[PDB]
Amino acid sequence: PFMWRQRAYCAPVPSAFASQQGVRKPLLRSNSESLSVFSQIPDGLLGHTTSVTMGNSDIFFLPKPSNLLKIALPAFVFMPNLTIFTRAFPFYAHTS
Amino acid sequence: GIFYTRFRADTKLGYHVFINEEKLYPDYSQNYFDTKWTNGRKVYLDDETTVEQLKAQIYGGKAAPENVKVACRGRVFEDADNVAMAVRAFCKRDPRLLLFQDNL
Amino acid sequence: SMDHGMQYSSIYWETSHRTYLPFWASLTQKFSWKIMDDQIRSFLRLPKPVTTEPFVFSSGSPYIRRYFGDADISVPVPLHAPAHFAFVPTGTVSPWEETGMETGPQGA
Amino acid sequence: ARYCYRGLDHPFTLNEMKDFLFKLREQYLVNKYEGIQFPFVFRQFNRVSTPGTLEVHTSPALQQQPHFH
Amino acid sequence: KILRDRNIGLFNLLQHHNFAGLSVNNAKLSDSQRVMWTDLVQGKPDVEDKLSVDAREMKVDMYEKLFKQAADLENPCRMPGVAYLRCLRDTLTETQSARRSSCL
Amino acid sequence: VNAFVVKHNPDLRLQFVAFASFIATHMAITKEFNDMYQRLVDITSLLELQA
Amino acid sequence: HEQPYRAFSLGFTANNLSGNWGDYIDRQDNKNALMRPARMMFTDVFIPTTK
Amino acid sequence: AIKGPSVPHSILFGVGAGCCAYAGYYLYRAMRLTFFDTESVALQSRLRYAEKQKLFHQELDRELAAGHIASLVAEYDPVATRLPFQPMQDRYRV
Amino acid sequence: ASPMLFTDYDNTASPKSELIFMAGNALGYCTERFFENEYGQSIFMFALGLAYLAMLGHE
Amino acid sequence: NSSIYDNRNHEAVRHPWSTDARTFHPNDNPEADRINTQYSNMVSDSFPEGGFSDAPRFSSNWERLLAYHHGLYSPEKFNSTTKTADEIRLAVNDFAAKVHADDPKNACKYLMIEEFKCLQSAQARIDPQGAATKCVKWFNEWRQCAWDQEKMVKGYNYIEDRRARKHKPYIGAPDLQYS
Amino acid sequence: NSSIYDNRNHEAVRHPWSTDARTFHPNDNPEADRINTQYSNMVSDSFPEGGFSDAPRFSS
Amino acid sequence: RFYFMYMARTTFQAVRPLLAFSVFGEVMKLVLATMSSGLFSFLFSFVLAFEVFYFFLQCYISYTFLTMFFTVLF
Amino acid sequence: VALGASFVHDYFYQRRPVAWC
Amino acid sequence: DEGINLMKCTKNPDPSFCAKEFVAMRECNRPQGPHLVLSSSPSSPPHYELRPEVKHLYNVDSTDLGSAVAPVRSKEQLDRVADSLKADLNLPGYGHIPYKWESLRPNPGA
Amino acid sequence: QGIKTVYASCRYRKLNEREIISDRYTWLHERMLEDEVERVLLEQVPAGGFDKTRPGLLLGPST
Ligand SMILES: CCCCCCCCCCCCCCCCCC(=O)OC[C@H](COP(=O)([O-])OCC(O)COP(=O)([O-])OC[C@@H](COC(=O)CCCCCCCCCCCCCCCCC)OC(=O)CCCCCCCCCCCCCCCCC)OC(=O)CCCCCCCCCCCCCCCCC
Ligand SMILES: CCCCCCCCCCCCCCCCCC(=O)OC[C@H](COP(=O)([O-])OCC(O)COP(=O)([O-])OC[C@@H](COC(=O)CCCCCCCCCCCCCCCCC)OC(=O)CCCCCCCCCCCCCCCCC)OC(=O)CCCCCCCCCCCCCCCCC
Ligand SMILES: CCCCCCCCCCCCCCCCCC(=O)OC[C@H](COP(=O)([O-])OCC(O)COP(=O)([O-])OC[C@@H](COC(=O)CCCCCCCCCCCCCCCCC)OC(=O)CCCCCCCCCCCCCCCCC)OC(=O)CCCCCCCCCCCCCCCCC
Ligand SMILES: CCCCCCCCCCCCCCCCCC(=O)OC[C@H](COP(=O)([O-])OCC(O)COP(=O)([O-])OC[C@@H](COC(=O)CCCCCCCCCCCCCCCCC)OC(=O)CCCCCCCCCCCCCCCCC)OC(=O)CCCCCCCCCCCCCCCCC
Ligand SMILES: CCCCCCCCCCCCO[C@@H]1O[C@H](CO)[C@@H](O[C@H]2O[C@H](CO)[C@@H](O)[C@H](O)[C@H]2O)[C@H](O)[C@H]1O
Ligand SMILES: CCCCCCCCCCCCO[C@@H]1O[C@H](CO)[C@@H](O[C@H]2O[C@H](CO)[C@@H](O)[C@H](O)[C@H]2O)[C@H](O)[C@H]1O
Ligand SMILES: CCCCCCCCCCCCO[C@@H]1O[C@H](CO)[C@@H](O[C@H]2O[C@H](CO)[C@@H](O)[C@H](O)[C@H]2O)[C@H](O)[C@H]1O
Ligand SMILES: CCCCCCCCCCCCO[C@@H]1O[C@H](CO)[C@@H](O[C@H]2O[C@H](CO)[C@@H](O)[C@H](O)[C@H]2O)[C@H](O)[C@H]1O
Ligand SMILES: CCCCCCCCCCCCO[C@@H]1O[C@H](CO)[C@@H](O[C@H]2O[C@H](CO)[C@@H](O)[C@H](O)[C@H]2O)[C@H](O)[C@H]1O
Ligand SMILES: CCCCCCCCCCCCO[C@@H]1O[C@H](CO)[C@@H](O[C@H]2O[C@H](CO)[C@@H](O)[C@H](O)[C@H]2O)[C@H](O)[C@H]1O
């Protein structure tokens, strides 16, 4: 509230300088309202727009013809076997 | 130790404290394991803690400088204010506090 | 010369970029539980939101809600014709005039 | 998502506010001018309406602005 | 011609936005607003002993809001006005006789 | 359920007809609800354009 | 912990790390200068301009 | 179409199945809203908070614009409204 | 001085005892970035495919 | 004009009076070593110290009046030089003293002071639009702080919902508590 | 300005003095029947009879 | 520190083929985008074939190191 | 079994919001 | 009576949460009298009315400030409001679809 | 979790009701304070009301 001619974002809209226009719309409005989203537009369906959900579409099906294969295939190890040597695991886990 | 750390982290709420100037740093020359102040320090507090209690905890219950105040995101706190609620109001989910001198 | 413009940039799909659409996507359609929830609330007499009441208690000055064809779409409108005040004297400033050039206290 | 479910009273910064207003302006222009396309709004479509006798001319050279030296 | 037109337009704009100045020449004012403005311009703002402390606080807040909207930081009288109203806030729980000696 | 279905649609063609009618009715009711919500959304978009 | 993340796509066939498309306002060409004249060659479908 | 096994009967059966599916949806939502919902209350509270915030910001911006306009009362000169060789009117706040 | 002349806000240290959260924070980052989205669905399909291949090889 | 979203960008501003259209060019490719990094030598990269060369000499007083009335002239903007660092500091310190006297127990005080400071530093007297482009951020922060102070004064809170089932992305991740 | 090879085409001509920039628009889509085909009625399609509105009143 | 060393080695051996397939592919694509004539294309076809063979070599190396790193006695 | 599991996983466990205009 | 009714209602509240009682008490406690009242009418929906002697303090054209109850959801009212807004805007370009997903269905997706 | 959720739903309903009524009571308290202030102000109005035709303060000649 100090530099009015230099701070136009805090100034009234040009329709306010015009001296002409149940309940009526306000006569005085500022440009600082542009810094708010729901100043002029309504807040309708504000907290209900993230609730419109749609399901995924992936199908987990792939025929598994094993009659074509006669050899084994390599397989990964995902976790260490804690059912054996459980008490020493923190002590031998760092080795190889 | 793991239990203490996890419980403190998942139960209490912490703040990263900074200080504006070096002349405002506390005197940690006597106490051991911390012989100097470092900005960005994580400090865990209770929900009932006030700005005065925080200031005393920072300055070791000793005479603090004059006109020292706390701010978060540029917004000054009152000394008779709850830190948790003041942060909730001014800097939500950005608890970085700054201690400065308010002469003006 | 802005309406009905030509295609100014090219449209393309980069190799192996995914689409995330199955073959029944066109038959798929959206849905919101909001209409059914409103019906159920009205039938079971569940707590209503305050937006159903036109008067607004969320401020000290009088506000009235204007509804756009539904209670879910409303805007508060102030009723007061606010009186403004200026602790200023009149005729004490001539900004168009350069005052640094005239001799006098106002000039200095 | 930021205001009603995370507790942020000021979800949008200046950049996000500008982005919102940019999209609002684009909506206005799209509904105002029928068929407006990329150069003025971020939008492209192939099936466009042309006059029938489309003239092709070279654009005018860029305006010579006065400069020192 | 230009000055006459500009000043008539300014007058119409001020009348349209319902402004009131040091010369109270506005008929659409409420009696309470007019009393408050005339006290700020011509009389002495003071809280009455008939009021409860809460109503005195409300009256002082109304005075402060009105005067701060009226006078900006560039205005000379803003600091004295705000100081007087702050003295009133400090001396709410007192009588006018005891408040005069302090706020004069 | 299988008994009640076969009791009234014992043949494959009738089962297919019933399944198709079920799909169509589901889609139609969903379309009614969606039309209502779309009218709301259209009002909001028109107010944004007005702003 | 409050700043948002950019989408991630990585595979033997395609990725989204060899380029940057920019923001919604400040956009930029994802392909670099040497291959911009040959953009057609990096597409499964290409719909040219109208001129 | 009412009793006998026919294409109309199958169509009626499908329509009834769809209506029963939507009745089940109604039951699900009714039970959820009647015994398993706090998001509604939380969101209503947050929206009332938002309304208060909106009105506060609105009033603040209005006050700032009003102060901008008040800065013009110093430029305002009621004597310029005077016509040459005529008296000044109190209407223009002497 | 004023609180706005200060800039070094990103030097947010943390107790050295919180290093135990290394893997936790790593998994949380990987979750918020990859696992709980479409790329995470692709990763889940990759795991299912590993199972598929192991079964195929056994048979 | 500066914005790329303006058709007459990099073109001189048009006034009711005749004006030399040769524009001030900011320093876009400055040398690595700028030995003097004081405000004196920095301001010359974005404004001319002696002011712009688009000032009018009105043939009459009513032309001046009409230009002002329509918002096309202000002496504060057209007949003036750049402000020196000392002047800027004096103005900022006076404004800060006045604000502190107005209200010490206010949280947005330093934010208002900072927007004032940034306007003065960006020379809003002679480049108001360009300076507002820089200071609107501190204005917005002040707006936010105003709301925050009001809600702390008048107790305004809301019913928070229960904690979400997946508040933590991973069980081993720490759920840092936030006020 | 008229030429399409001008950047300020269909824009008012700039003068040293202040000028109303609302331009005279030639008749581009005239009606089929132009009952008066005299020069009097034809000249109004390309020029204004009373002249253009860009004349100056020099202060000196 | 051994865990960090092991994870680094594992990730490098796992991404080696991805690198050979992606970054060298980008290089080849640059060359394709820039080249127009026929002699250079005739000579570059062989570079492409060499890249094929190199990819297969990297895949073999990765398979070896991964079966070494994912082999458990018990 | 795969179709049933995919249906459940997609329309009960993997639902995500979508914008509506 | 206003205070008594407010007290009685706030312990056994109405779905409206006693808003009319609150506003009645607020308007009755005014010194010179109420400015805003609830019109007694044989009509089904009641209205909020404004006294004439205070009309100059409010930004209104008439004394009827609208109904005291929100509207009822109606497809017809929604269509009416939408058509009115479209007419007031007068924007050539509304409803235009430059590209539509090719399908036998008229509206793919929605 | 379902038991806790049922209890929480009931508690949240009651709490929403109480919060609404409490905020409206606060509003009413403030408005009643304003009304008291206005009733005290109306005593300072001179007999016969204000002369809304003339300015309260005449601050210059009219020649
Ligand atoms: C070398 C490496 C080796 C090591 C392996 C390492 C890897 C290990 C890990 C595993 C890999 C994981 C990697 C991550 C994956 C993430 C990416 C991803 O998955 O999606 C990407 C990719 C991205 O697509 P998008 O653009 O993003 O769209 C995504 C959508 O969600 C999906 O898009 P969509 O829905 O549009 O596509 C589905 C598609 C296909 O969907 C299906 O068809 C469903 C599947 C059914 C399969 C069973 C039916 C088989 C019928 C065969 C009979 C033919 C006649 C017999 C002839 C014999 C002589 C030849 O639908 C259609 O195109 C139209 C078909 C519609 C009809 C389907 C239903 C009817 C089926 C019955 C036919 C009836 C016809 C009646 C006609 C009407 C008459 C009135 O997704 C797809 O492309 C999906 C389809 C992929 C098919 C690939 C084709 C090759 C399949 C063979 C694979 C290898 C086989 C191995 C041997 C086993 C078979 C013998
Ligand atoms: C070639 C093949 C031919 C195929 C032919 C197909 C045509 C045949 C007709 C059937 C068509 C398939 C229908 C599929 C379902 C509808 C489509 C769909 O999924 O939309 C998504 C949609 C997703 O809901 P949303 O709100 O958008 O978001 C979901 C999120 O999860 C929400 O997120 P949130 O965080 O809020 O989580 C909330 C969640 C929370 O959930 C939980 O926390 C736990 C869930 C319960 C776990 C179990 C705990 C134990 C307590 C329950 C005890 C149940 C067992 C009984 C025990 C008795 C002893 C006490 O609540 C729920 O999701 C409740 C789920 C309700 C499940 C119970 C309904 C009965 C299931 C059995 C139905 C069998 C149908 C077989 C059809 C024939 C297919 C061959 O589904 C729903 O809206 C809810 C479905 C309500 C049931 C509707 C049933 C009528 C429609 C089907 C007509 C036929 C009825 C036959 C009835 C037979 C007697 C049971
Ligand atoms: C801050 C630090 C951050 C650091 C980074 C951190 C990173 C994040 C955290 C990471 C944590 C680690 C997590 C693990 C890593 C994650 C990996 C991951 O998730 O993947 C994501 C990533 C994909 O994610 P995305 O976001 O969706 O990427 C974009 C899409 O991928 C784009 O899709 P697209 O447009 O490029 O289309 C691709 C297309 C590709 O489709 C194809 O390639 C299929 C072409 C088949 C042609 C021939 C088919 C003949 C069959 C005829 C059947 C009878 C006639 C029926 C007629 C209809 C069918 C044709 O579709 C598919 O991919 C289909 C996949 C599903 C089917 C899989 C089939 C597996 C069969 C395996 C057979 C095993 C045989 C063993 C025999 C051993 C020898 C004795 O993975 C990929 O790279 C995708 C490509 C995967 C390669 C699959 C190639 C399979 C080819 C099998 C050929 C078999 C022929 C054998 C011949 C030899 C015997 C003669
Ligand atoms: C040789 C192998 C066999 C070849 C034949 C395979 C194709 C059979 C299908 C034939 C029917 C085509 C329909 C024609 C009528 C016009 C409609 C139309 O075409 O638009 C569809 C589409 C364009 O659609 P649009 O432009 O978007 O407009 C409307 C939409 O399509 C539609 O509107 P919407 O979006 O609203 O509809 C959504 C929804 C509507 O549909 C649905 O919702 C569900 C539909 C799935 C029904 C599932 C069956 C139901 C089963 C019930 C019973 C269950 C129990 C019993 C079964 C148990 C199973 C064990 O999804 C669909 O649209 C599904 C459409 C699937 C298109 C066909 C996909 C196959 C592509 C070609 C594969 C070629 C394979 C390699 C050939 C190798 C030859 C060397 O165009 C095509 O699909 C083209 C088909 C071309 C067939 C070519 C056959 C090979 C000829 C080779 C020629 C040589 C040159 C080829 C170049 C490469 C040379 C090497
Ligand atoms: C054998 C069964 C064991 C099952 C596990 C039972 C839990 C055992 C640990 C309980 C710790 C009790 O000790 C207490 O913990 C809480 C949380 O840190 C602290 O309380 C702290 O958080 C709560 C929540 O705001 C508040 O009290 C306050 O903010 C703060 O003081 C108390 O200051 C401390 O006295
Ligand atoms: C997780 C890592 C292992 C998996 C690797 C995944 C694929 C790697 C991506 C391709 C690497 C080469 O990527 C190539 O260099 C950079 C990538 O930013 C881009 O280059 C572009 O962005 C860089 C920014 O750093 C600019 O400096 C450069 O002027 C511009 O052309 C090229 O457009 C791209 O072709
Ligand atoms: C074959 C598999 C090959 C890939 C294997 C990769 C396994 C290792 C996963 C990555 C571990 C990185 O570790 C993690 O890095 C991110 C930053 O990038 C940090 O995250 C930090 O910066 C990010 C910004 O992106 C913030 O969102 C986050 O709030 C912050 O904590 C995590 O605090 C740290 O725990
Ligand atoms: C002997 C004591 C009981 C021992 C058994 C403890 C089992 C607790 C783990 C169950 C899962 C809890 O997971 C989560 O934590 C607490 C409840 O605990 C709830 O948290 C929420 O409700 C509780 C009420 O109790 C509030 O205090 C809390 O402020 C709120 O965030 C979440 O709604 C729930 O989803
Ligand atoms: C035709 C037959 C129809 C059968 C109908 C069956 C109805 C079953 C309805 C169960 C709905 C439960 O819905 C889900 O339950 C859990 C606890 O129970 C709720 O609670 C869960 O999430 C919220 C927060 O996200 C918190 O309460 C808490 O963290 C967690 O416990 C979920 O918010 C709710 O989404
Ligand atoms: C044909 C009948 C077959 C019987 C199948 C019965 C299975 C019922 C199990 C349903 C369990 C779903 O569990 C629920 O999944 C949904 C995802 O869709 C999650 O949903 C969550 O994410 C979505 C999307 O962000 C949001 O709406 C919200 O944050 C939350 O609801 C819930 O956090 C989880 O509680």
PDB file of N, CA and C and ligand atoms in Angstrom, chain G residues 1-3 5, chain I residues 21-22 24-27 29-30 32, chain L residues 7 10-11 14-15, ligand 7:
ATOM      1  N   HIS G   1      10.802 -33.393  -1.213  1.00  0.00           N
ATOM      2  CA  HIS G   1       9.675 -34.273  -0.938  1.00  0.00           C
ATOM      3  C   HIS G   1       8.344 -33.657  -1.337  1.00  0.00           C
ATOM      4  N   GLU G   2       8.338 -32.399  -1.773  1.00  0.00           N
ATOM      5  CA  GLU G   2       7.150 -31.762  -2.313  1.00  0.00           C
ATOM      6  C   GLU G   2       7.263 -31.454  -3.797  1.00  0.00           C
ATOM      7  N   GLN G   3       8.462 -31.498  -4.362  1.00  0.00           N
ATOM      8  CA  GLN G   3       8.571 -31.329  -5.801  1.00  0.00           C
ATOM      9  C   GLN G   3       8.140 -32.603  -6.530  1.00  0.00           C
ATOM     10  N   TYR G   5       7.747 -35.550  -9.686  1.00  0.00           N
ATOM     11  CA  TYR G   5       8.640 -36.386 -10.471  1.00  0.00           C
ATOM     12  C   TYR G   5       8.277 -36.339 -11.947  1.00  0.00           C
TER      13      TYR G   5
ATOM     14  N   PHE I  21      18.209 -45.851   7.612  1.00  0.00           N
ATOM     15  CA  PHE I  21      17.106 -45.652   6.685  1.00  0.00           C
ATOM     16  C   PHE I  21      17.559 -45.599   5.236  1.00  0.00           C
ATOM     17  N   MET I  22      18.801 -45.984   4.948  1.00  0.00           N
ATOM     18  CA  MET I  22      19.310 -45.913   3.583  1.00  0.00           C
ATOM     19  C   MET I  22      18.448 -46.737   2.635  1.00  0.00           C
ATOM     20  N   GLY I  24      15.580 -48.156   3.211  1.00  0.00           N
ATOM     21  CA  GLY I  24      14.187 -47.754   3.280  1.00  0.00           C
ATOM     22  C   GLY I  24      13.879 -46.590   2.361  1.00  0.00           C
ATOM     23  N   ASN I  25      14.712 -45.550   2.408  1.00  0.00           N
ATOM     24  CA  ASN I  25      14.517 -44.403   1.532  1.00  0.00           C
ATOM     25  C   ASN I  25      14.722 -44.782   0.073  1.00  0.00           C
ATOM     26  N   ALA I  26      15.672 -45.675  -0.207  1.00  0.00           N
ATOM     27  CA  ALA I  26      15.872 -46.118  -1.582  1.00  0.00           C
ATOM     28  C   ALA I  26      14.624 -46.806  -2.120  1.00  0.00           C
ATOM     29  N   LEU I  27      14.071 -47.740  -1.349  1.00  0.00           N
ATOM     30  CA  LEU I  27      12.872 -48.446  -1.784  1.00  0.00           C
ATOM     31  C   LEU I  27      11.680 -47.506  -1.869  1.00  0.00           C
ATOM     32  N   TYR I  29      11.799 -44.286  -2.643  1.00  0.00           N
ATOM     33  CA  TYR I  29      11.983 -43.528  -3.872  1.00  0.00           C
ATOM     34  C   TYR I  29      11.617 -44.369  -5.085  1.00  0.00           C
ATOM     35  N   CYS I  30      12.111 -45.607  -5.132  1.00  0.00           N
ATOM     36  CA  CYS I  30      11.797 -46.480  -6.255  1.00  0.00           C
ATOM     37  C   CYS I  30      10.307 -46.777  -6.328  1.00  0.00           C
ATOM     38  N   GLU I  32       7.738 -44.626  -5.162  1.00  0.00           N
ATOM     39  CA  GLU I  32       7.054 -43.418  -5.598  1.00  0.00           C
ATOM     40  C   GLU I  32       7.345 -43.088  -7.054  1.00  0.00           C
TER      41      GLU I  32
ATOM     42  N   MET L   7      26.519 -54.809  -5.468  1.00  0.00           N
ATOM     43  CA  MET L   7      25.394 -54.260  -6.215  1.00  0.00           C
ATOM     44  C   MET L   7      25.877 -53.449  -7.408  1.00  0.00           C
ATOM     45  N   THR L  10      26.850 -55.966 -10.071  1.00  0.00           N
ATOM     46  CA  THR L  10      25.665 -56.615 -10.617  1.00  0.00           C
ATOM     47  C   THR L  10      24.925 -55.690 -11.570  1.00  0.00           C
ATOM     48  N   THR L  11      24.722 -54.434 -11.167  1.00  0.00           N
ATOM     49  CA  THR L  11      24.008 -53.498 -12.024  1.00  0.00           C
ATOM     50  C   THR L  11      24.777 -53.230 -13.308  1.00  0.00           C
ATOM     51  N   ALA L  14      24.337 -56.100 -15.567  1.00  0.00           N
ATOM     52  CA  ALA L  14      22.965 -56.209 -16.043  1.00  0.00           C
ATOM     53  C   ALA L  14      22.650 -55.174 -17.112  1.00  0.00           C
ATOM     54  N   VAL L  15      23.230 -53.979 -17.011  1.00  0.00           N
ATOM     55  CA  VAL L  15      22.921 -52.919 -17.964  1.00  0.00           C
ATOM     56  C   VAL L  15      23.838 -52.921 -19.181  1.00  0.00           C
TER      57      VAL L  15
HETATM   58  C1  LIG P   7      19.216 -53.905 -12.193  1.00  0.00           C
HETATM   59  C2  LIG P   7      18.684 -52.801 -11.283  1.00  0.00           C
HETATM   60  C3  LIG P   7      19.410 -51.484 -11.613  1.00  0.00           C
HETATM   61  C4  LIG P   7      18.823 -50.340 -10.766  1.00  0.00           C
HETATM   62  C5  LIG P   7      19.052 -50.631  -9.265  1.00  0.00           C
HETATM   63  C6  LIG P   7      18.924 -49.312  -8.465  1.00  0.00           C
HETATM   64  C7  LIG P   7      18.839 -49.618  -6.948  1.00  0.00           C
HETATM   65  C8  LIG P   7      19.143 -48.321  -6.150  1.00  0.00           C
HETATM   66  C9  LIG P   7      17.900 -47.391  -6.196  1.00  0.00           C
HETATM   67  C10 LIG P   7      18.363 -45.909  -6.211  1.00  0.00           C
HETATM   68  C11 LIG P   7      18.881 -45.510  -4.808  1.00  0.00           C
HETATM   69  C12 LIG P   7      18.981 -43.962  -4.737  1.00  0.00           C
HETATM   70  O1  LIG P   7      18.799 -43.524  -3.393  1.00  0.00           O
HETATM   71  C13 LIG P   7      17.861 -42.529  -3.299  1.00  0.00           C
HETATM   72  O2  LIG P   7      18.172 -41.466  -4.299  1.00  0.00           O
HETATM   73  C14 LIG P   7      17.165 -40.389  -4.246  1.00  0.00           C
HETATM   74  C15 LIG P   7      17.603 -39.290  -5.151  1.00  0.00           C
HETATM   75  O3  LIG P   7      17.862 -39.815  -6.419  1.00  0.00           O
HETATM   76  C16 LIG P   7      16.972 -39.830  -2.838  1.00  0.00           C
HETATM   77  O4  LIG P   7      15.771 -39.032  -2.837  1.00  0.00           O
HETATM   78  C17 LIG P   7      15.976 -37.726  -2.499  1.00  0.00           C
HETATM   79  O5  LIG P   7      15.966 -36.908  -3.755  1.00  0.00           O
HETATM   80  C18 LIG P   7      14.664 -37.031  -4.427  1.00  0.00           C
HETATM   81  C19 LIG P   7      14.649 -36.159  -5.645  1.00  0.00           C
HETATM   82  O6  LIG P   7      14.579 -36.962  -6.792  1.00  0.00           O
HETATM   83  C20 LIG P   7      13.517 -36.623  -3.503  1.00  0.00           C
HETATM   84  O7  LIG P   7      12.274 -36.860  -4.165  1.00  0.00           O
HETATM   85  C21 LIG P   7      13.536 -37.382  -2.213  1.00  0.00           C
HETATM   86  O8  LIG P   7      12.533 -36.822  -1.324  1.00  0.00           O
HETATM   87  C22 LIG P   7      14.863 -37.309  -1.554  1.00  0.00           C
HETATM   88  O9  LIG P   7      14.877 -38.188  -0.413  1.00  0.00           O
HETATM   89  C23 LIG P   7      16.806 -40.889  -1.798  1.00  0.00           C
HETATM   90  O10 LIG P   7      16.888 -40.274  -0.482  1.00  0.00           O
HETATM   91  C24 LIG P   7      17.840 -41.952  -1.900  1.00  0.00           C
HETATM   92  O11 LIG P   7      17.544 -42.996  -0.960  1.00  0.00           O
END
